[PDB]
Structure 1
Amino acid sequence: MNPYILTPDLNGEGLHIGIVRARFNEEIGQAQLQACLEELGKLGVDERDVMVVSVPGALELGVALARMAESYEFDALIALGAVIRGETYHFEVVSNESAAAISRIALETGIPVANGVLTVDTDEQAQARAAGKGADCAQVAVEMANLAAALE
């Protein structure tokens, strides 16, 4: 059985990307954004075609991402930030709701939203993953933007 397999497309030329960065544990999101923007340029995304906004924390990602997607000016969005466990169930609540809103936005608007929100126990874990997750989200935004076009 040899069906049609759509080959992934990582060509960023012409894409419009939005990025919302939660600033809680700011050093983490900044490292993610530096890696993220850098990778987007590598993929061919124009610097003039990227908007970056920031919010206080991960629970504010939903409302900001929702607007940018509902504008339909963007082929794909990226959510950045870090939830680091402290002393309370607040970690579970934030991790759960921020990810759930990122899922909901992509389903209801058709705009892919790369989920680059870390959910980790320690500062060191977030530092170890920051740059990697940032560049990954750049590749997710580009690829899924192109995949959404093929399916419209």
Structure 2
Amino acid sequence: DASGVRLAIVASSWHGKICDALLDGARKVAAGCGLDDPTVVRVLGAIEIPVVAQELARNHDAVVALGVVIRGQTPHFDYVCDAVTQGLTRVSLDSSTPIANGVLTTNTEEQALDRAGLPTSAEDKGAQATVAALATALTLRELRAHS
């Protein structure tokens, strides 16, 4: 059970259908664990996630970062994903808070659809990341001060 944990979810909006599916999977895991109302924030792109995740981390036991980065024609994909990786890792360690990475980094749109948790998808990384965030928050709760 994870009813006591304060969960935040930050989801980017670039590729709306896939982003909403990831968020759907996140909210479903949250509600299944006894959390009907997690803090849900929307940002435009994946680069905007870390700075919002940092704000959310000040008031929550866990933050789920959700987004979809699909490779285009330029090397820009690599550096967007690099920024997200660097940002979320820093935010997690700065705040000592699990920042779960449900940010899809795919070569094609099909690969992103297949990992969003749609009807015919093979997996749901939005669901997976929320499990990851909540379990780590509960683990840290057991590791931290409680008399």
TM-score when scaled to structure 2? 0.90
Which AA in structure 2 matches 1:145? A
In the other structure, the counterpart of 1:79 is 65
Quote the offset at 1:36 in angstroms.
1.0
Per-residue CA deviations over 1:97-121 (Å, capped at 9, x if unaligned) read 1121111111111110000001101
In the other structure, the counterpart of 1:27 is 17
2:134 paired residue among 138, 142, 145: 142
Quote the offset at 1:151 in angstroms.
2.2
* Consecutive unaligned residues in structure 1, runs of 5 or more: 1-10
Instruction: State how far apart, in whole Å, the 2-side matches of 1:109 and 1:151 are.
Output: 16
Mapping of 1:83-122 within 5 angstroms? Answer: 83-122=69-108
In the other structure, the counterpart of 1:8 is none
Structure possessing the higher radius of gyration over alpha carbons: 1
Per-residue CA deviations over 1:17-58 (Å, capped at 9, x if unaligned) read 00100111111110001111011111222x23x110011100
Answer whether contact 1:32 1:135 (CA < 8 A) is retained: yes
Answer whether contact 1:110 1:148 (CA < 8 A) is retained: no
TM-score when scaled to structure 1? 0.87
Instruction: State how far apart, in whole Å, the 2-side matches of 1:108 and 1:151 are.
Output: 18
Instruction: State how far apart, in whole Å, the 2-side matches of 1:150 and 1:43 are.
Output: 17
After the TM superposition, list the runs of 4 or more consecutive aligned residues in structure 1 that deviate by more than 4 angstroms: none
Q: Which has the higher helix share?
A: 1
Answer whether contact 1:99 1:117 (CA < 8 A) is retained: no
Q: SS at the partner of 2:74?
A: coil
Q: Report the number of matched residues.
A: 138
Q: SS at the partner of 2:64?
A: strand
Q: SS at the partner of 1:24?
A: coil
In the other structure, the counterpart of 1:43 is 33
